[model samples]
Target: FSELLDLVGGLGRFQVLQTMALMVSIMWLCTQSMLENFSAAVPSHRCWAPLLDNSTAVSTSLSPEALLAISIPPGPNQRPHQCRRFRQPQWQLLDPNATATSWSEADTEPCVDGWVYDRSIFTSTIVAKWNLVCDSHALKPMAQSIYLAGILVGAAACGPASDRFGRRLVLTWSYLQMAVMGTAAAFAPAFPVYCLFRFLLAFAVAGVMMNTGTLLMEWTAARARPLVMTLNSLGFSFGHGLTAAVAYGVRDWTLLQLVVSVPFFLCFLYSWWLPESARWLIIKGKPDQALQELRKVARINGHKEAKNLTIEVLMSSVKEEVASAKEPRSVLDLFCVPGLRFRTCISTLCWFAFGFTFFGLALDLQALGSNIFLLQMFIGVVDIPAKMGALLLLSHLGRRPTLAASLLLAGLCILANTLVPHEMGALRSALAVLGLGGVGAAFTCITIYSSELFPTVLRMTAVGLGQMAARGGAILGPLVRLLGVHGPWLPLLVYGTVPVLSGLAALLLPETQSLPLPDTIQDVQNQAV
Candidate 1:
């Protein structure tokens, strides 16, 4: 951040106007993430009574409620059973007080007809729509994982494509393509088709996520890059929590999909106006294209000095700048970039550290020995302000500094819990939650910082790889937390140490604040030199 933070803070009219425009796209992209929460949503359900299917056969005098009381058995939880119903209806029974214990004796079995869904929470869910329970119970969780698989695949696929194509162009197509597929998945007549559509939806979401931040970072100057980038994260976090809010009212999954997807169709037209990354044009050896974008940026900011700009003058501004690839790049060339591979390794490790720490805190609530529900609600509640605070500190302190502060802060808080006796349950849990806040904010900013650290060719790819690494950490976090059998402090030690060490690795990155985005791997090398 150096003098960049100390100077005008890049709080110019152009930066402000552009970031205001940026939030609209951020919100649109964030809605795509909400799909998983709704699609995989499971609500209470139960079996349809066979006798109730042909209610006319029972008796004209028998009411639907009375018949159901006779045919369905109340479960041990005393709610009507979810998957079992009486084989024969006792149409002769006059006493409404007749117990299911008497009527259901060996006669009750799994739903012979179809499911009668519990609509108390959801009028319908994917699980209820497809009857994905009892025999297909394993599928509910697998359905959630399928969306994850799309993201996993999208990372690898979209990253290289974004490099090959312009970031804005690729995302423009993705936004519309993803919206079409997302809406189609709602009307899918078959489950297999639904999965495929959902997978493709995730694939397109990858393009938006992979390139959106890269575009934002490239447009903004360094001093305030973190604040601008963090706004994108805020949009994601907002949309993440908003899904539940909307889902609470719109219980039908199909209805929910239509509502969320329809609005994004408007975003498709936004592609025409969305600015291409000027730095990307320069890297591809299109100085005229780069110059056009820069003029708009410079002109809007009242830079009369940009009127004389040309390719020769642009080239002369930096020594050997033409060494930037005039040819297309290979995906693997990202590794060949000097200082980039090492930086990629560091970023990936830090992503895992934050992911593991976040998930570890979330999944292993028993480690804190407090009321798990209260602790969960407590942590979820606290993350909002903690996030707002991070946005303010990042630009002033610089990327590596604030990142390191949070990591060190997390380590101290986590370690402090261990250093204290286990008898301090309330105190220990409080310290652990505080540790989660530090790493959580660290993650939010890192999500912003990551796109700036890599070149245009590999920026999206780096994001993809880092996300995959974080996914690995997420999978491993629960198992790692199980290391308590080895020693109580073992999980804490790993979580606390990983971020601190990774933060040290973060210092290896060149400061991206106020610096022009690197056009090629060669530019990366020049900076590192």
Candidate 2:
């Protein structure tokens, strides 16, 4: 297949056009993956207090702030209470130097009238719209978890579906699915309906990722593979920054979602022009179609011998691959063999840790103690260089070292963030940004590294399995944030440790930095040991 690609001008004009298209989708995909940061963001809020008069008519002439001061008890940090308020306005407490003891003695009750959200940053979010606060605060993370669960399910299905159905078909379908599902979520009237659309949207998101990855690997040469994958990683970082900018501009959650998603309809439209992976076509006993696709590429690249290409020549290039493709592979086969199983276990662990820690940090933008918009942009900017540096390190230093080092560094930074005092906002945010950069680099390394580790026959299958592991961890990552009420440091502690452990586990995997992508399970078995 590699030889065949060379004949058609591998990494030529055709590859560049397709990669650019995929890159556009990657940017949108990043927005969808990280959209919750804005869409579900918990704005500063206080319990809504509607003080009624005896006749249920207009009551207090006091200004809104003055009335709120008298109505709601002061909470820690001198903000209005979030969950409770005075049973009756304590007019005397308006006096300066009101004693804490006297304030406590005043009767208080749960917020009976909903909440008043500070919408200066976000005019609306799910948190504000759905009132996912106080008693319902857990619902915020639950929504994210549900989305991740969708990714998990999508990962399980899209892998086999792509391997069976072909990458072009799956990728095109996913684009349409993402467009419809994401648009539907914006108008969802009920929380469950919103979640339902988000889940379906996420399902398509996973499909886009899995199939695009397979396509990227399948179509390109080994020398350019890392560079192309790095571009995809960089696109993700751009998505993170883009999300912050768009969210800042729009300030409305539904509109923000539409801004990120509606463009996929364009992606779906252009995707029809995209070619199928010739390698995959030949392997699936469709040399006729594969030959046509290869000729299209050769013509685009201006290869003079394009007309000389024949099915026999294409089949000869990957004869062994075609033979192995006859016996259908299953996910269970991943663990059935010793070397493959060993590689799968460590790869899955690396992905899980990356997902767990990356999301744990990325999703909790409020905790970084700076303006979330600035924090979001800064974190995203940091990944640009981090992944670029990872490209250099990965190309020169070998994938194993790069993967392990990045994960360990991220873990160390997260753990160090725990030691910073709450008042040291600058230091804490700095550490978090650095930690996120490390995770970003790890993501770049592991994505290319994982694709190289598996054979083409089960590439999407194996990658999907790893994605499921990552989604599993991602689901837990937000839920772990819920533990912040018990102790703020506990969640970071878990996030920091898991990556460190996974980093160590990465050391056990074999290196394949410059090797050709394996074409069959036998190729995997031979190369791994």
Candidate 3:
């Protein structure tokens, strides 16, 4: 930890910022890890013993030789005998007194020339040939929702904790726990165990992501904050791309999970580099430490040292006028103020819509009538360009317009998909592009806007709340899948409409871009438009 601190800066400098960045990146990676396991977790009817039993019983009467004789060779030069052997039929055996007479008669007969009566071998062969394992269509979305649920919980808990404690501490602890839990999840012996561990891992990931953004924003000057936030989004996209690559390389679920956890191990190196948040230090009456950290930040930005170094003066200047200001309020205080309540409502809706649709669409890619691997690759690839688009559009368009437009476009696209005939490839691709673009932009907007709207004291809390809303959406995403929404376009319609409404609701929020953050109910009331 000390060594990492030296590399980035001492705790008095940019350590906290570095730690936050690393932690957020790791959290994004954890989300990607879930995608890696998604395809593998879906339990298919093909994997079940009953399904295999039915299939084998039907195929057994026709011997391997007879089956092969009936099958035509693909090419004249092809070896028919080899093809026949490869296509050998599997049969089920049973006793005379067993349920089925045909199965019983087959079991009593001796094996023909080349065949053996090895029950173990036959059972193994039947399992290999007929057993259905993962049902990607049913499982992927469910697993995605479960993982997102954990993220919501973690984000909610960590956001306020980071503000109360420090970004570096919160990030380190979150990353460490997530890494350990994620690794353990890879070896989970059962589906339930895997889901439980995955939830824990996701929770840790949420805390890391939320704190990292807050820390990054605090470390940078106001002018640089946008860029820093954009870079974080880029990091998330990069993580997604990395997940696709890793999934392709490591097809095995456990190995892919283990590979994803490797970054968490490297995160331990952060202890040396990550410092406590300087902004937090200032808030906590450690003005000297904050100044020292500020000087380092100035140096990093190639500027002269900050003129104001006295903590007492800074604290006194912003000191609350109310004698009761020191008293803490209950959680209910979040919604007690008009502006805060408004902000909370809009932010929560946006988060819920974003989480519901983004994860829902991503996890349900397999059911969209496309090749799962190809769909995943396409989704991962789009994130990179989408992030770049967000950076360009966010600056010129501003928060409200960008968010609203994205959500609106996404919803329209989803609805449009339903209108397009399935045979129209061009229309489908166009709609997909629109949907993906909207989802990506909405995701970026929520995180950025949520952090920007609240004061330092409640910034993390707001983000956590927003994340929780999203998680709530994620839980609902899969259940929506189960609802007989058979048309490929119906799910997208749902994904699109909710966010469109969210974007419309966002218009009700005061533009936070140029305003000094409101710290209390009075401040909120005074500043609210």
Candidate 4:
């Protein structure tokens, strides 16, 4: 497959168009995944009271802040109470000499009227729109979990569908799905409807993500795989920053959601230009079709002499691979074969750890005491250098060392951060950026490593399973962060330790750096020796 790819100028104009096109979609994937950071943001809020808005003597005379000061008792930090207010207005609080002793005696009750949100930073968010604060705070996280579940379900369903239907077809359909579902989410009148649209959007996102990965891997030359894969991973990091940038200008959540999703329509339009995976075509005994696809690449890449290559030479090149591929494989086969079982399980573990640590830390950035947009931008900025370094190490030191080292680096940095006092916010944030940078590099390596590790026949399935595990980890990452009620450091400890363990486990998997991608289970078994 690599030979055929190279014969048609693997890293040529066609591949460049393919990669660039895929890169745009991948960037949107990042934006879509991280959109909740802005869309669901919970702004500063306090209990709403009739006196705050009613045009009576008190409401007409007092300023909004002054009314809130008297109506809503001070909680921690002297801010107005979020969920409670004085049963009767504390008129004594108006006095200049009034102390905490005078106001603390007032009887308070849960907000009966509603809530008031400060919208200086965000004109609107799901939190403000639906008033999902205080008692309803749990619903915010639930929506995000629904989205992640959609990604996991999409991975399981789309992986097999892509394998059966062909990468281009599935990818094109995913693009359409993203465009339609994502656009529908913006106009969703109710929270449940919005969640449904977002969930379906995430479902299509998984299809785009998994199919995009396999297509990039199968179409590229072995020598260029690392670079192409690294670039694709970098798109994800850039999307994190892009989300913040786009959200900064569009404070309304619906507009922000629309902004991120509308681009996929364009992606759907140009998707026809991308060719099907020739390796996939050959494996399915479509050598004639595969040859035509290869010749198209040859013409596009100016490798005209390679046009002499025929279906016979192509079939002979991977005869045994084609013969074995005739027997349909399933996900159960991934576990049934010992060699594959070991690799698949370990790779899935690596992906899970990546999701667990990376997202736990990324999603919880507010603890580091910085502006959310700035933190998001910093997170994305840090990944560029990390992934470039990963590209260098990947091409030189190979996938195993790169994956293990990046994971270990992330884990140790996170563990070391626990020792830093909260007062040293700068140092803690810096350490986190370093830790997240390591996560970024590890993400790049793991994505490329997984692509190289699995055979073509089961490649999408393996990637999908890995992603399903990743989504599982992602969902649990925040749930584990809830353990902070027991101890603030508990989540960080778990996040740090899991990656370190997975890094050690990664060493058990074989190195796949200079090898051609395997085409069948037998090809993988032969390489196991």
Candidate 5:
């Protein structure tokens, strides 16, 4: 009986230990799975897939059957072979040496002349081959318009989410959703399905793109912020350039999508490296975490005694700068304060003008009667130099003057287009170059200017609101084409005038050139004079 009692006591202790071990293991597994899932959803990763496949079919040669399959059928009284469905006219086929000849004509001649069999259309085509799709044809602009509409809604929803929760959290979720939905979009069974997913992708893209700028700016030092912000614009152009290169390499849309999406795996790496925004942490009363992040940044940047810096020291330094600053701002304060109200109004208008003209003109170059491929290539090439020019001039000229000049010049160029005689060759190219350069610079300026206007606390929300206005303009831009309003020049005229007005409005606001960002509405209002 004594031996049995001893054995029972030992078994009870063992059972308790076993239960504790099981609980610990389960908790660890849950944590690991959550981390893995979060890592899978970063913007860098989601951005890869869309860029990979968006331009894939545009760079390659298409077979006759494949070309025919994607092309809308020619109506009665229109020859199926001669219809101008693919941005190419029938006359170009007879004049292969003509510089101004259309590509669709050239594409069809090989099949018509019996040099290539009709069934060869099923062969995979590169992005270049599908100029109609890649070069911003009717469908593409339509898609962009629809997509922008979704962006408008997403900004409304996501801006609050980022501000309320955190940029990292919102970005992670949006990117994950974008990747999942965007991939599914590629295989959509119908045009409507394709359009629906395109809209969803746009919505997610708006949130991620806007939030990236906010996060990156908050993380970097003030001295480095401009360059980093400029890089965001550069990153987009780089994405475009990379898209072209990848499209050249992988001609199939589905395959191209997979290749682009491969970068999404990098989101896992981002999770380990990326800290929540310090600015955000402070606003949320997490001063300790914010100081830890700041100290880490100081260390990485080679500050002395970074390891010895304390949270008290960090908070004191920040507190000294804005000792009299007001409490945290709410959304209503965005418009309630006079200086902020003016800045917000002008910024929103500028963004609206920029988005409408910039995107509209870009996607409708073919409709303007240029060779789609050549036009697209020219458009992409101009951005590199234009961006470089903006970088060089931004510091010297200051934001207001540089922005005004870009807007005015862009508008003037578009107005100049009205003066170009139909038969004038050299003048057309000059107009196009001037107009495109203005548009490019203006686009970059809006991004930089918006970032500078708001304090770190509400920067993302302010920028998101500005971007939402821009997206609204993008949605309306297509209406000009759809409604056939006063021919092509009418839209260009409207695009030009709005920016000029924006430039004039820009004059009313104080230059943010060297001023420390305002922390509250009172600070901004006091400085307005």
Candidate 6:
């Protein structure tokens, strides 16, 4: 682990530039992952004022309360029924708070004259723009799930290619392509075309995350990694908070999307300098290239001793990593390798659970009954300390203990929040925010641990597979949120319990603390003992 990273003084000045690029890239990923909150923001909606939609149907206009008196039916606490309608406008009802006593219970129907949404929050959203309520309400969640499916493909497909091809090439192209698709999506004329661009943009985004994430893990030395990766993940918290602020200002989804996308341009710009992992170069049978990259790194970091570095030394390092497995590393062998199958399965499950809860709660922020933007910003603020605290947790408690503890804390917080009665609004928000903060720490841990558990040859492969599982879980998140119709607790219950189980599962994997990351499949197999 030290061989390549040490030549550049491990945590040297060169590492800063390399790490900073990924740090900036992470902001975009964080922002986009949560963008659905705004783009698809579902505000309070009701059947349209039929009299208003058809001017001939009624001669005069009505205020919101007047409209509610007749067209929109009252529900619990005098709130207007969302998707349902009172068969016909009962304009004769004088009180805006007309009860079932005042109006016949038999007058009920689906949304007729489209919907009237409260645009006090967002001027528009996918839900409002498309009138995606009643029968169409489900489509919004379906679109979110479709985006997750695209992410799943990217994770499964993008990882190994980066491991096989150089990180720099894969990352640069992916970033550039993502920008193209994302920009095109903003100007898409129709929903179908917009969806097409969404899938492609996600595919490219996945490549960027996998490539940059793996490269950072490989480039940093073992002991220094706890601090390095912690600060690195802090980028996500920074971005999450940034998204809240950006969304706060740019109410238009297109403008907000444009802001999120421009970072990929910066990513491609850095491609010229983001050193291809020297370890990866050596693994790919290019010791000379690896040596040159390392020497350049040493010179940049002012590590003069690396002047003596040579191709032979690099080749020897490669030889140590020469595994029992060879080129064309079969995906099946992940199942065949001793202990690897279990390790991979456990890791995948943990990732799935993590994504399941993370996205499930994040996308369901409206459930907290607070200002959605402020709630998002509050959660982001809560996560900052949790992210920074992961370093100390990892340094002292190590990976397994720290990861398990964070996951357990998240589960407990979610469960507690779910149990709180809806009348206690502030308490629910506090616990929900705390749960997200814990999940944030665990999210950081899983990313770093996935790299540590697998060898260099299959490292990105494992990371990719883990990401695939995560996306698979994420794919279910929007649908799970749809369960709010049955009862609010259904979504909370699923999100709360799964991570606790996954955390218990994580303890079964090999604990890696203070141990240098294994370089080959055999090294991983041996460490598992």
Best by lDDT: 4
Model 3, span 393-508: residue lDDT tens:
87777788888888887777776777778689767777777688788877777777787777665677788888888788877876676545576556666766797788788887
TM-score (C-alpha, index-matched) for candidate 4: 0.95
Error of 4 at 147 (Å): 0.9
For model 4, residues 1-529, the per-residue Cα lDDT tens digits are 7777767887879878878878878988898888888899888988778777565644256777777688888887567678898988888888768888774443888878888898889999988988888888999999989999999999999988887779989999999999999899988999999999999999999999988877888888878888888888888877877887898889898888898889999999999877788889989888889988888889888886984689788977878778787688899999999889999989999999988887766755656546888888877887899999999998899899889999999999889888999789888878887888888899898899998888888889999998899999988987787789999888789889999999999999899877878888887889977
Where does model 2 exceed 4 Å of error?
Answer: 50-64, 92-106, 363-369, 417-430, 479-493
Instruction: Look at candidate 2 and give me any clashing residue pairs.
Output: none
lDDT of 4 at 387: 95
lDDT of 4 at 488: 87
* lDDT values for all models: 0.70, 0.85, 0.62, 0.86, 0.58, 0.78
Candidate 5, superposed: residue stretches over 4 Å from native: 1-142, 302-304, 320-329, 364-375, 482-488
Query: Please, what are the lDDT tens digits per residue for candidate 5 over residues 90-127?
Result: 33333336442334343432222111112222223211
- Candidate 3 wrong stretches, greater than 4 Å: 1-33, 36-143, 285-289, 295-308, 312-325, 363-374, 485-492, 519-522
Worst 10 residues of 3 by lDDT: 121-130
TM-score of 3: 0.76
lDDT tens per residue, model 6, 1-529: 3756765677878778878878878777778777887888888887765564565664555675676567667777467778777777686675646556776667778775677878787887777877777676677877777778888898778887877787888888998988788788767777788788888888887887788777777777776776667767787788778888989999877877887887778777877776778877776667778878888778878888885778667666556564433556867878998778988999999999888888656644547655777777766777799888877787878899888998998888888976678799888777877778788999889988888888887888888898898988877766676788998788878888898889888888778887888767777767756
What C-alpha lDDT, on a 0 to 100 scale, does residue 411 get in candidate 3? 73
Positional deviation of 521 in candidate 5, in angstroms?
2.9
Instruction: Select the stronger candidate by lDDT from 5 and 6.
Output: 6
lDDT tens readout by residue for model 1, 1-529: 1122112124566667756665665565555664554565556666776556665664568677777767777787677677787777666454866553555357778886788766666677788788888788877756555665677788778877787777889888888877899899889898888888888987887777767777777776655677777776666555545554566567788988887787667777756666677667666666678767766666666756665666665656532454656666665765775677787878888887776677666544446544433443444455666777787777677677778777777777876767888677778777877776787688776887777677776677788888767656765665576789989888888877877787777777666665666656776778877
Query: How far out, in Å, is residue 166 in model 1?
Result: 1.6
Give the best candidate by TM-score.
4
Q: Please, what is the TM-score per model?
A: 0.79, 0.92, 0.76, 0.95, 0.72, 0.88
* Number of backbone clashes in candidate 5: 15
